From Swiss-Prot:
Homodimer. Interacts with host STAT2; this interaction inhibits the phosphorylation of the latter, and, when all viral proteins are present (polyprotein), targets STAT2 for degradation. Interacts with serine protease NS3. The lineage of its organism: Viruses, Riboviria, Orthornavirae, Kitrinoviricota, Flasuviricetes. The record marks K55, K174, E210 as: Essential for 2'-O-methyltransferase activity. This is RNA-directed RNA polymerase NS5. Sumoylation of RNA-directed RNA polymerase NS5 increases NS5 protein stability allowing proper viral RNA replication. Phosphorylated on serines residues. This phosphorylation may trigger NS5 nuclear localization. Changing G142A: 70% loss of N7 methylase activity; 60% loss of 2'-O methylase activity. A motif (SUMO-interacting motif) lies at residues 71-74. Replicates the viral (+) and (-) RNA genome, and performs the capping of genomes in the cytoplasm. Besides its role in RNA genome replication, also prevents the establishment of cellular antiviral state by blocking the interferon-alpha/beta (IFN-alpha/beta) signaling pathway. Inhibits host TYK2 and STAT2 phosphorylation, thereby preventing activation of JAK-STAT signaling pathway. S-adenosyl-L-methionine binds at S50, G80, W81, T98, K99, D125, V126, I141, Y212. Changing R157A: 40% loss of N7 methylase activity; No effect on loss of 2'-O methylase activity. The modification Phosphoserine is found at S50. It comes from Dengue virus type 3 (strain Philippines/H87/1956) (DENV-3). The record marks D140 as: Essential for 2'-O-methyltransferase and N-7 methyltransferase activity. Residues 1-256 form the mRNA cap 0-1 NS5-type MT domain. It comes from the Viruses.
C-alpha cells in the first residue's frame, strides 16, 4: 500500500465540514472576486475564464513548459490555458478541444490579448481524436473519483492517448493519480522516452493528488510523488492554515 492510497483512504473518511477545511489548508490560490464579477456582467477583456490561466502561468513563469508554435490544448474546458498561451510571444496558434455537453464545461468566447489565434472546439472527445501536428501539447484531463482504481484507469488512458501527440515537443500533462504503482511504471517508461519531470503545482487543492508531467525538467518521479503524499498526509494533522491569496492574472485585450 502506497502513502498515496493511505491519503486517499483518509480523504474518503472526512465529513463534508472537515473536507471543506482540509481542501484549501496551506495552499496558494488567486482571488477570483473581480473576474467572477466581470464575467457575470459579460466582460470579454482582461479576465481569465477560470483559475486555470493562473495554474498554467505558474509552470510557464518557471520555464517548466515554454509554449511555442502551434499549441494544442486537450480538455480546454472554458479555455483558461488557451487564452493564457494566446498572449505568449512564441505562440503562433492555439487549438483547444473539449468534450462539452452535460457534466462538462463549454468554451467561453473572449477578447483577451491574442484571442485571434485561438479556436476552441466543443463536442470533441479527445479519446476518439487522431493526433495532430503541433509544437506544444497541453492536457488538463482527469476526473477525480473516491476509487483510486477508477482514477488509475483514467490516468493510464490519458498517458497512452497523449503519447502520439508528443513528437519532440513542449508539454504539460495533468496526471490525476500519480501514486498508483502501475501509473508509476507508465510514467517512468514515458520519462525514459520523452524526458521531463512530474511537478506539484502549489495552486492545486489538497483534495487532489494531481501532478503535472512537464517537458523541461529532470528528477526521480517516485521520490517527487512520495514527497506530495507526505505533504498531503501532514495537512490532515493540524488546524486549517488559510491559503496564500494572490492577485489573479490580467490577460489584457486586443489582437496579436
Ligand atoms: N454543457 C451543458 C449542456 C447541457 Cl444540455 C446541460 C448542462 C451543461 N453544462 C454542465 O453540465 N456544466 C458543468 C460544468 C462543470 C461541472 C458540472 S457537474 O459536475 O455536473 O455539476 C456541478 C459540480 C459542482 C458544482 C459546484 O457548485 O461546486 C455545481 C455543479 C457541470
Ligand atoms: C480541469 S478542466 C480544464 C480547465 C482548463 N485548463 C482551464 O484552464 O479552464 C478539464 C476539462 O477536460 C474536459 N474533458 C474531460 N474528459 C474529456 C474528454 N474525453 N475529451 C475532451 N475533454 C474532456 C472536461 O470537460 C473539463 O472541462
Amino acid at each position: 500500500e502506497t502513502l498515496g492510497e493511505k491519503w486517499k483512504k483518509k480523504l474518503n473518511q472526512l465529513s463534508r465540514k472537515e473536507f471543506d477545511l482540509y481542501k484549501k489548508s496551506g495552499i496558494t490560490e488567486v482571488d477570483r472576486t473581480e473576474a467572477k464579477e466581470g464575467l457575470k456582467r459579460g466582460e470579454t477583456t482582461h479576465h481569465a475564464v477560470s483559475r486555470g490561466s493562473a495554474k498554467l502561468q505558474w509552470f510557464v513563469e518557471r520555464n517548466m513548459v515554454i509554449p511555442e508554435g502551434r499549441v494544442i490544448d486537450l480538455g480546454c474546458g472554458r479555455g483558461g490555458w488557451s487564452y493564457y498561451c494566446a498572449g505568449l510571444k512564441k505562440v503562433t496558434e492555439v487549438r483547444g478541444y473539449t468534450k462539452g455537453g452535460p457534466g462538462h464545461e463549454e468554451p467561453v468566447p473572449m477578447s483577451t490579448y491574442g484571442w485571434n489565434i485561438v479556436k476552441l472546439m466543443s463536442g470533441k472527445d479527445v479519446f476518439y481524436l487522431p493526433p495532430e501536428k503541433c509544437d506544444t501539447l497541453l492536457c488538463d484531463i482527469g476526473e477525480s473519483s473516491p476509487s483510486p482504481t477508477v482514477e488509475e484507469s483514467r490516468t493510464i488512458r490519458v498517458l497512452k492517448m497523449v503519447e502520439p501527440w508528443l513528437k519532440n515537443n513542449q508539454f504539460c500533462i495533468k496526471v490525476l493519480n500519480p501514486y498508483m504503482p502501475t501509473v508509476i511504471e507508465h510514467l517512468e517508461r514515458l520519462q525514459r522516452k520523452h524526458g521531463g519531470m512530474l511537478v506539484r503545482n502549489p495552486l492545486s487543492r489538497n483534495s487532489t493528488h494531481e501532478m503535472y508531467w512537464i517537458s523541461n525538467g529532470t528528477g526521480n518521479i517516485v521520490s517527487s510523488v512520495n514527497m506530495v503524499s507526505r505533504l498531503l498526509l501532514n495537512r490532515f494533522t493540524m488546524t486549517h492554515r488559510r491559503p496564500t491569496i494572490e492577485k489573479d492574472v490580467d490577460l489584457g485585450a486586443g489582437t496579436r
